[PDB]
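Appendix B: complex inputs.
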Amino acid sequence: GIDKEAMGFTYSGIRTNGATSACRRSGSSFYAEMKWLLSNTDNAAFPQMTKSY
Amino acid sequence: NFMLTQPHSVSESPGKTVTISCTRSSGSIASNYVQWYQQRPGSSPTTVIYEYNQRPSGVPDRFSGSIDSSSNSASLTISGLKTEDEADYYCQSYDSANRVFGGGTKLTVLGQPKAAPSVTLFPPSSEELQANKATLVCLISDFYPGAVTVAWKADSSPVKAGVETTTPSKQSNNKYAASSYLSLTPEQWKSHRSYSCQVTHEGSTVEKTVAP
Amino acid sequence: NFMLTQPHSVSESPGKTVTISCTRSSGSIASNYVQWYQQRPGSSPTTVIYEYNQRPSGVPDRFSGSIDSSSNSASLTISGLKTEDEADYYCQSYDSANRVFGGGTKLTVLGQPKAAPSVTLFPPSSEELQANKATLVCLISDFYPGAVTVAWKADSSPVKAGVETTTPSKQSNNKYAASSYLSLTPEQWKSHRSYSCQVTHEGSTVEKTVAP
Amino acid sequence: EVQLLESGGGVVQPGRSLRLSCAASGFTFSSYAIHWVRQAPGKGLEWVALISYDGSNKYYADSVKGRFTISRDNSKNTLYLQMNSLRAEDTAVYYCNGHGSGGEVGSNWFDPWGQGTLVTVSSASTKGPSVFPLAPSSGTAALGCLVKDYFPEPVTVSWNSGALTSGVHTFPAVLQSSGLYSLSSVVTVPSSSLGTQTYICNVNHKPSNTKVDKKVEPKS
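Resulting structure:
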């Protein structure tokens, strides 16, 4: 078995709830354990980041 | 950063195919998505193409989008034109987050043979020169399609001292009419040999001049 | 779909190298093969280059082909020019199946110093105006190379109402001569201040005007 | 059912301020980013501003920076454009236009537009039209009558007291850079009637109550 524990990752100034028609949990969803980081607005410059664990 | 240039106008007979270009001055056309918008007179714009080639639900199969990386352009093409298609078309791309719109392209579908304009210039009124002023009157009428360029010249040279109207249709002959007013003073009106009302219509540039 | 633009003319001294460009208006020059054809006066064309760089059996090593993807062009270059090379050259590429030919490039090898033309314009005959007509007569003579552009202007403005001949050689001085005839009516001839016979020769654009 | 409702449009003077609002209904407003796109009359579209789904980011056009300020209330589903320190060129129709992925990447094209709210920024001076003569330079010719520097529209033109209507046309008006209107009206005739009948021009601009005549006679 596997033991899932949060990495406490949190971000400021981007989108973190990307969705896609493939991962379809009664609507456009994504991987339950992952985050699809996107720019705040379309085409907007994405900020360089560095997260550790 | 960059600007999108599309032709001022284009025309083609019904049933024939037509293409409209959209050239990006700086940066790759493939760097950012290009949307093609249609605006009918008075109506709000409706997207005809998105993401360079995608046809939203409702737009007929005649509308197609294309990318020419060589000329760094984007082309909207309609096959089998219909009189309903006669509207203005704007291409729009993206600077980093800001949207950028094209200059517009007036697409007129032929409903009659092409007619050259009837230019009638007017010398400035005398009592206006007695008010120490000068405003020319260039009248353009009976031309089809309704796309016309009106450049005034100080003896074949760029002048920017005039005000010219848009090109509305005729309530009489289903043609289009327009006017233009070049404003100066009798000193400049006598220190230059003449001034030209230049009217490019479908490439054929009719001209009428005025001299002191 | 697209057109191939090559310069109207080019010239260089014998022994020197020369290059001719071929720019594709729409679509990548690398999308379709480009053939370089040579046509001598009266003779049928002979391929000098094929598939952008390949030298068919018989063509000397002086002929080379090149591709400039940046300017979307194709270049035919001859090193160590010889008077035999003086002919017209056409680049040809392919739309999907149709062939597309360039506008031609008159390559003249220098056999003497360059001579500017001798322009002699003529006012329209009076009895022609008595026949309600007007046809100008612009005579161009004693110019080398034999490449010349003749644009008429309605006081510095595009006119398309004239007929002008090609540029044949001289049976006297090994130079080239030509003529031009701008056709109008006395109404237009008096409703415009003048008309210009503009003659661009090797960039130097000699001009001669006529006024009512 | 999805719709956008622009409100707050009207006529103003330069240097003043204005506020515009967009009412969103029929979709998940809280998720998409919203844009302000205007269009001057007779001109093409121009992107003005945009604000993100959570208001964190606001992006303005370079031609409007400093003056305009975009904002949104998701609890009320309302968009706000603060157009203070207005200029003369800002006169345009103003559309609110939703434009964004909205968290999904499949994203069937979703780009709604409103009907647009007119924003006219003219200076002042309801004025009376000044009439000027327009003479023909001597088998047909034409002459005219000039109606310059008036405000506001419309007018009523009558050549020779509503008599000569055959071969006569009246063209639409222009908006001068000075903010005041002006229009013309020309009559076409054969080259015969030159000097025969004097041509008095009779205009009528209603609010200014100004009606002026102007006879045309060839110069020398």
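The radius of gyration of chain B is 21 Å.
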